[PDB]
Design a protein around this ligand. Structure first.
Ligand SMILES: O=C(O)c1cc2sccc2s1
Length: 126
């Protein structure tokens, strides 16, 4: 069902949460080799989350579930903000700009915390 597909997508998103926090610790510790690997792992997780979210949105549309479509459109827009911040963080790491990396890291944490009440709303709506 689309609901169980959303629970699967929620789990992939929580995997990114866990990997992100491990990455933040490694950054603070200066373990750049670890950070590089965690950033690659996070890119794969976000690409997978984004794809599962698009399939869920498309399915809600085909089902005529107007409220779920509305919430998923709002949620998928915010996801793209996070993706942009994340990609900027990756570039800051490539460039050796720890000041920009720190900034984007906190921004991605706040963008993610803000989008959580809506994430829970979609679970109820599908
Ligand atoms: O795909 C997701 O839901 C997330 C990726 C990341 S990276 C930091 C917080 C999050 S939440």
């Amino acid at each position: 069902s689309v609901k169980s597909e959303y629970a699967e997508a929620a789990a992939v998103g929580q995997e990114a949460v866990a990997v992100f926090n491990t990455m933040k610790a490694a950054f603070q510790n200066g373990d750049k080799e670890a950070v590089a690997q965690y950033l690659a792992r996070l890119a794969s997780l976000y690409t997978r989350h984004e794809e599962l979210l698009n399939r869920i949105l498309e399915k809600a549309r085909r089902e005529g579930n107007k409220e779920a479509v509305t919430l998923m459109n709002e949620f998928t827009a915010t996801f793209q903000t996070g993706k942009s911040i994340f990609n900027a963080m990756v570039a800051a790491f490539k460039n050796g700009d720890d000041d920009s990396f720190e900034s984007y890291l906190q921004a991605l944490e706040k963008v993610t915390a803000k989008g959580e009440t809506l994430a829970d709303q979609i679970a109820k709506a599908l």
